[PDB]
Structures are given as structure tokens and as C-alpha cells.
Write an enzyme that holds these catalytic residues in place. Structure first.
Site, PDB file in Angstrom:
ATOM      1  N   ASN A 183       0.884  -1.211   0.163  1.00  0.00           N
ATOM      2  CA  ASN A 183       0.123   0.047  -0.088  1.00  0.00           C
ATOM      3  C   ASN A 183       0.869   1.169   0.140  1.00  0.00           C
ATOM      4  OD1 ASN A 183      -2.401  -1.204   0.168  1.00  0.00           O
ATOM      5  ND2 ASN A 183      -2.441  -1.395   2.280  1.00  0.00           N
ATOM      6  N   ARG A 184       0.299   2.434  -0.090  1.00  0.00           N
ATOM      7  CA  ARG A 184       1.042   3.754   0.281  1.00  0.00           C
ATOM      8  C   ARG A 184       1.556   3.518   1.653  1.00  0.00           C
ATOM      9  NH1 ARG A 184      -2.297   6.484   3.467  1.00  0.00           N
ATOM     10  NH2 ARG A 184      -4.600   6.647   2.886  1.00  0.00           N
ATOM     11  N   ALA A 185       0.588   3.074   2.567  1.00  0.00           N
ATOM     12  CA  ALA A 185       1.075   2.998   4.004  1.00  0.00           C
ATOM     13  C   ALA A 185       2.069   1.754   4.137  1.00  0.00           C
ATOM     14  CB  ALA A 185      -0.261   2.834   4.755  1.00  0.00           C
ATOM     15  N   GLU A 186       1.859   0.816   3.690  1.00  0.00           N
ATOM     16  CA  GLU A 186       2.687  -0.399   3.690  1.00  0.00           C
ATOM     17  C   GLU A 186       4.078  -0.014   3.215  1.00  0.00           C
ATOM     18  OE1 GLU A 186       0.368  -3.439   1.534  1.00  0.00           O
ATOM     19  OE2 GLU A 186       0.059  -4.465   3.376  1.00  0.00           O
ATOM     20  N   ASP A 232      -6.462  -7.898  -1.642  1.00  0.00           N
ATOM     21  CA  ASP A 232      -6.435  -9.087  -1.712  1.00  0.00           C
ATOM     22  C   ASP A 232      -6.728  -9.505  -3.173  1.00  0.00           C
ATOM     23  OD1 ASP A 232      -5.716  -9.383   0.979  1.00  0.00           O
ATOM     24  OD2 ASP A 232      -6.905 -10.964   1.467  1.00  0.00           O
TER      25      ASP A 232
END
Ligand SMILES: O=C(O)COc1ccc2sc(CNc3nncc(-c4c(Cl)cccc4Cl)n3)nc2c1
Ligand SMILES: O=C(O)COc1ccc2sc(CNc3nncc(-c4c(Cl)cccc4Cl)n3)nc2c1
Ligand SMILES: [K+]
Ligand SMILES: [K+]
Lengths: 308, 308
Positions: A196-199, A264
Site C-alpha cells: 500500500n501507500r502505507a505499507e 487481496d
């Protein structure tokens, strides 16, 4: 991008390896306080259940048309039997290692007045004996699949990722990785990783602009033998990072009913598409449409062929 | 009071009728907050289990030496099977009615850092079909027992108390009632009822002194065809209320380790003692000693013969 025949997809086999878990929910109503503690009393009225973790990713692959295998570890208990049931009716081929000393991974939610009160987790570390047994399974299962998908949820079932990746790459099989955690040194060798952008924020570090985007990520693709990275940016869509350029794929559908399960669905599509012999660029697009569609539906939802 | 032979007690049969439930505990540790809600995440490390409700009262009767029967309703599920297991190994004779639409009554506790976080209840109202089926069982079971113990926890299994009492009294069998609730109109006919200072406080009303104690309680024994009342006063001990006088039985042991289960132990002793042909006055004393002793032990604890 041109559509993909139903017969092509039907040939696509995907080996999903990682952590499976049972998502369970307890809907009740609270009316009083416990006589023995200053805590609420939940009188459960309803339980909902669904496949979570790597099991969900494998479920998405099947509905699109492709075949899906699921290598994972499950305990010898009721929740384990439920996953087996859910898998069979979902069309996913199970390849399960059983560890009686391991509780089947469960994330239980307790709700009242349409809000959570507490989350309860049952999980443990799989024994080295079980991990190697499943690794032996992987050797047998690898040549029977077109593409391998690593679904990490940091529950222990992906301890031997580095070796599994190196094996699949040595056989010309692509390796996709849905990551989890700040440390990705385990993921070296992978064909594609999907954060993600956060991951990615809490591993590559905080950054500046879209040109600096390539500046860091391309360095990450060098640090670890990783060919491509697919960055899911929600609003902005998502961007593939090849060595021969980039690609952007913004929003498509117009419903933000529920975000859960979108990630997912994305990685499951790319895998199934690649297995059917579809170009990586085209596969990324089909994952974006699948993503866009499932957002218009509750949590674990799936796009089938006709919706694409 | 003179001791009671081991052969006498062995003859004592007690029919315990009421609500059974499984006491379950989840010990875990919380380290983070759920990503989807401002609530803690309990990673369970241990589960403890024990018979609760009417099952506990029946368990106390057996260890003292007497025989015990347990008429109750249980669902067709895992918790139901666990109660059956626990009952068999505890020496209690089961007489269970099965209702598949009824969840086996469960009071689940969730703990972390040696404190509760939430209590979870699984329970429902037994069908009229099931209640009458168990009432038919009671007719068959009544002549096979020396004394009948009504264990009410307001879970629905004691809907037909009034009729059951009237039957046991008509056969010369004594009826004991561990009550629950502010309304005791259902309990008319009973040989003996066993409330707390608090259980009686919120039904007879708040009061003044020990002479006024008899003033209200004797009126209650008239309002409902109830021969005797045993008032458990913890610190002050307990006091029996016959029609031919009273009796006091203060503290005996010197440990307040754990109060839980003390009440269940008391009424279970009186029943078993009466079944062996022991005077009511003497039976009250033996319940006081049993009470005093079990306080020096964790929750569901039992006094056997040798400790008396
Ligand atoms: O945050 C997470 O935990 C998961 O993060 C994800 C998961 C899947 C995707 S698919 C994607 C590109 N496609 C697409 N299409 N329509 C709608 C959306 C969308 C979503 Cl999905 C959430 C919020 C806003 C939008 Cl506009 N996105 N970005 C992500 C990011
Ligand atoms: O409050 C409740 O929910 C249950 O209430 C009960 C249950 C059982 C008994 S047996 C009894 C007389 N005997 C006796 N002997 N040693 C110790 C105690 C005792 C207890 Cl048990 C708790 C606190 C203090 C004392 Cl000093 N009591 N009073 C009750 C009240
Ligand atoms: K969704
Ligand atoms: K106790």
C-alpha cells in the site's frame, strides 16, 4: 486491453502460499454490567464467518475462472474443519499441513450497536517440523502450478519464503508477494511485490514527489532481487514499476461501500491472469478493474469473469 | 451435631433441577489496538473451563458422598458435549433434554493482566416443547430421588417450578430453592428457600433490626406456602427460619480466599444431608461448615466427607 477467453483462464493454476485465518464475528447486544467486573456483558445473537488471510486471496482466483491451490498450516480443531469446509465449497484446492499444537488462526470480533467492543486472536508459531513438512509439499506442488503467490500475514507460515521464492524463480515461475511488516529482506527474488501507500511508507520512508517515487522504489528493487513493484494508492489508483518503464491505473468504479478485501482481490487477479499467459501490463489493468468493482460490495467480495 | 455415616450419605439421592451453564475463561495478553476499531486486541494464551449453574450444585452433592441427578436443558453443540464430559467425570447422573435451537448456556470471560475486559453470554429461551418434555422426565425422576433441589439462574429451565414443587410436596419429598430475581411468586410450595442478604434485600425490602427480620420473613413464609428460609449473611453466618423457632450459624473457618461457589455448596449440602435422613437443624450446620471450608479454596471448590 483485449478480454481473455474463458478457456484460457480455466487453465490458469495459482499456488497460494501463506497464512490462512478464519474471520469470525459475534453480533450481540449489551444491556448490563458484569457483576464481577466493571465491564459490559455481550449477549451474542449471531455469528458470521468467512475465509481470511491467504484463503481469501485463493478464493478470488477461482471465481475469475482460474484454478487455485492453497499451501498453508492449519490446526487440528473446529476452526480448522470450518476452513476445510469453506475451502471445498469455494472451489479452492486445499494443501494443508496439520499442527495439533497450533491453534487455527482466528481473528474474532465482538460487536454491539453496530460497533466493535473487543478483538480476540487465536494464533501461534508453527513448529519447525511442520514448516519443513510444508516446504516439502511446496517442492511437489510447485511444478503443478503456473504462478506462485506469497500471502504474508506474519503468522509464521511464511518463514521459508526466501527459499520458496528461489525455487519458483529457478523453474521460470513468477512469484508474487502480498507483504506484511517493516522488514522485507525475506522477500528477495520475488517477481512482484504489492504494498500500500502505507505499507511502503513505513519501510522506504516518508518522501516528497512522484519523481522521487521512482528514485527510492527503484533502489529498493535493487536492494532485493525484485523485478517489479505494484503500488496501490487507492484514490490515485495504482502504479506498476517495471525496469522498462511505469504504468498508472487510477480509479474506475464509483462506489466506496467497503474497502476491505480490495488488496487481496488485486494480487489474486494479477496471479491468475499471468497464469493464463497474459502480459504483466495487461494483468495490472485487470487487477485494477477487479479492485474497483469489489469496493461496491461488502468485505470479502469477488469479481467473476462476466463483471470484467 | 453427631457425624453422619459414609453408608448413610451414599444412600442419599438428590434431584437437582434448573439451569446448567459452562463457565469458560480466556486468559490472554493485549499489546496493541485493533486497526479497525479503538478497541484492544486479546491474544488468548489459555482457556479454563468448569461446570456452572445447577451443574455445580449437583457436583457438590456427589463429593460429600451422596448421589445426585441433574435435570436440565442443554443444546446440541460442542459446549453441550463438554458439560456431558464434565458431568460424567464428576460423578453426577445426567438427565438432559436437547434443544438444537438452543445454545448451551455459556458465560465466557476475557482476561488480560489478571483483570476482566468483557463478558460474553450465549443463552436463549427453551421451547415450550422442550420444557414439557423435561417436565415429563421430572415425573419419572421424582420417585427415584429422596429430595429435590431447584437451582434457578433465570435461563428459562425453571419455567414450570410451581408445578414441579407441587408434585414433589405431594410425594413427601422436600423442595429446596436457590432463587434468582426480585419475583418469587413462582416458588410457592417450597420446603426451603436460600437467599443472600442481598437477594432478600431487593424483594422483602430494606429493613431495620433482627427482630424486624422475623417480622417480614415470617410474613413472606405466609404469602407463599414456604415452610422455611435460610438466610446466608456471610460475616454474620446464616440463620434458618422454621415455624418452631430459629437458629444461628456464624463464621467457622478462617480463610476468605475466594467467595465464589459458597452459596451453591450450602444448598447442596442441606439437600444431600436431608436425603440421608438428617434433621433440618443438623443439615443447616453441615452446610455452614461446608461453606466455611470452600471459602479457603478457588471458586468451584468442594468439601468432601473427611473435611466435615
Ligand atoms: O489500504 C489498504 O489496506 C488496501 O489498499 C488498497 C487496496 C486495493 C486498492 S486498489 C487501488 C486502485 N484501484 C481502485 N479502484 N477503485 C477504488 C479504489 C479505492 C479504494 Cl480500493 C479505497 C479507497 C479509495 C479508492 Cl478510489 N481503488 N488502490 C488500492 C489500495
Ligand atoms: O454473596 C453471595 O453471592 C453468596 O453469599 C453467601 C454464600 C455462602 C455463604 S455461607 C455463609 C455462612 N457461612 C460462612 N462461613 N465462612 C465464611 C463465610 C463468609 C463468606 Cl462465604 C463470604 C464472606 C464472608 C464470610 Cl465470613 N460464610 N454466608 C454466605 C453468603
Ligand atoms: K470489498
Ligand atoms: K469457593
Amino acid at each position: 486491453v483485449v478480454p481473455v477467453p474463458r478457456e484460457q483462464l480455466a487453465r490458469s493454476r495459482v499456488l497460494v502460499v501463506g497464512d490462512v485465518m478464519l474471520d469470525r464475528y459475534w453480533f450481540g447486544n449489551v444491556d448490563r454490567i458484569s457483576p464481577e467486573a466493571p465491564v459490559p456483558v455481550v449477549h451474542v445473537q449471531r455469528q458470521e464467518e468467512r475465509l481470511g488471510g491467504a484463503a481469501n486471496v485463493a478464493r478470488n482466483a477461482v471465481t475469475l475462472g482460474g484454478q487455485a491451490g492453497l499451501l498453508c498450516v492449519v490446526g487440528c480443531d473446529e476452526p480448522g474443519e470450518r476452513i476445510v469446509e469453506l475451502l471445498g465449497s469455494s472451489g479452492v484446492t486445499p494443501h494443508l499441513e496439520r499442527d495439533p499444537a497450533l491453534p487455527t488462526t482466528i481473528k474474532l470480533r465482538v460487536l454491539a450497536r453496530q460497533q466493535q467492543l473487543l478483538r480476540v486472536d487465536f494464533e501461534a508459531m508453527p513448529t519447525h517440523e511442520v514448516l519443513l513438512a510444508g516446504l516439502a509439499r511446496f517442492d511437489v506442488l510447485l511444478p503443478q502450478h503456473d504462478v506462485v503467490l506469497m500471502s504474508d500475514y506474519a503468522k509464521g507460515g511464511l518463514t521459508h519464503v526466501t527459499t520458496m521464492i528461489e525455487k519458483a524463480r529457478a523453474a521460470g515461475k513468477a512469484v508474487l508477494v502480498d507483504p506484511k511488516g517493516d522488514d522485507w529482506a525475506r522477500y528477495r527474488g520475488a517477481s512482484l511485490i504489492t504494498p500500500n501507500r502505507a505499507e511502503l511508507r513505513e519501510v522506504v520512508g516518508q518522501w516528497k514527489s512522484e519523481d522521487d517515487l521512482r528514485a527510492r522504489v527503484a533502489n529498493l528493487r535493487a536492494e532485493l532481487d525484485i523485478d517489479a513493484l505494484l503500488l496501490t494508492r487507492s484514490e490515485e489508483g495504482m502504479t506498476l514499476f517495471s525496469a522498462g518503464g511505469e504504468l498508472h491505473a487510477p480509479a474506475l468504479a464509483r462506489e466506496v461501500f467497503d474497502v476491505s478485501g480490495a488488496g487481496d482481490t488485486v494480487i489474486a487477479t494479477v496471479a491468475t491472469m499471468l497464469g493464463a499467459g497474459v502480459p504483466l501490463v495487461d494483468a495490472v489493468v485487470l487487477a485494477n478493474r477487479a479492485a474497483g468493482i469489489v469496493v461496491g460490495k461488502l468485505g470479502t467480495a469477488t469479481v467473476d469473469y462476466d463483471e470484467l
